[PDB]
Amino acid sequence: MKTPLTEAIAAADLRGSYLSNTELQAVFGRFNRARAGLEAARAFANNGKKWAEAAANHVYQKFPYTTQMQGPQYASTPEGKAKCVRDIDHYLRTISYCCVVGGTGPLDDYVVAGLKEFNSALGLSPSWYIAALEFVRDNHGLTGDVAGEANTYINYAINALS
């Protein structure tokens, strides 16, 4: 998949030239955010399970039909509910990868070139996952630079599902 480093080398290789100082300065300056993105990667790995399970609960309360209705796409069973926390934990895992990379690549390949394609042959609602992500955005308790990265990718995923 793509990262801004893989993109910058790919572009400079296509025109057969070295990376100029200005292209090389945008690699020097993204090491401030990538240091912050490594604390966010270590924060997501620490509380991800509990955040995902707490996020699942909010969705169940916000959309009570999901826990009582039919059964193919609905969390009517305790097995279906387990699958919801796993689906949510997966977003949190992909968002952590984006923070380590300093780009949207991991999400671009999971949601845009992934989820938005086959959900026509599944029928789950994006709103269930936007609410889950809004809950983890407003309840993670992260600092400043660390919060910056986590909130950039959580918000990119929310909008990718739009």
Binding site for (15Z)-phycoviolobilin: which residues? 84
Which residue's CB is nearer to ligand PVN, number 28 or number 121?
121
Sign of CA dihedral 89, 93, 96, 98: negative
Cα–Cα distance, 43 to 49 (Å, whole number): 11
CB of 75 to ligand PVN, least distance (A): 4
86 token code pair = 């796993």
Residue 35 interaction partner, one of ligand PVN, its own copies, none, beta carbon < 5-8 Å per kind: its own copies
Cα–Cα distance, 151 to 87 (Å, whole number): 19
109 token code pair = 């390949």
80 binds ligand PVN (CB under 6 A): yes
Which residue's CB is nearer to ligand PVN, number 6 or number 127?
127
Binding to ligand PVN in span 93-122, by CB under 6 A: 115, 119, 122
Which residue's CB is nearer to ligand PVN, number 74 or number 146?
74
75 binds ligand PVN (CB under 6 A): yes
Q: What are phi and psi of 118, to 5 degrees?
A: -95, -5
For residues 4 and 111, is the Cβ–Cβ distance under 8 A? no
4 binds ligand PVN (CB under 6 A): no
Q: Which residue from 73, 69, 83, 62 is spatially nearest to 131, judged by alpha carbons?
A: 62
For ligand PVN, the binding residues (CB under 6 A) are 59, 66, 73-75, 80, 83-84, 87, 115, 119, 122, 124, 126, 128-129, 132
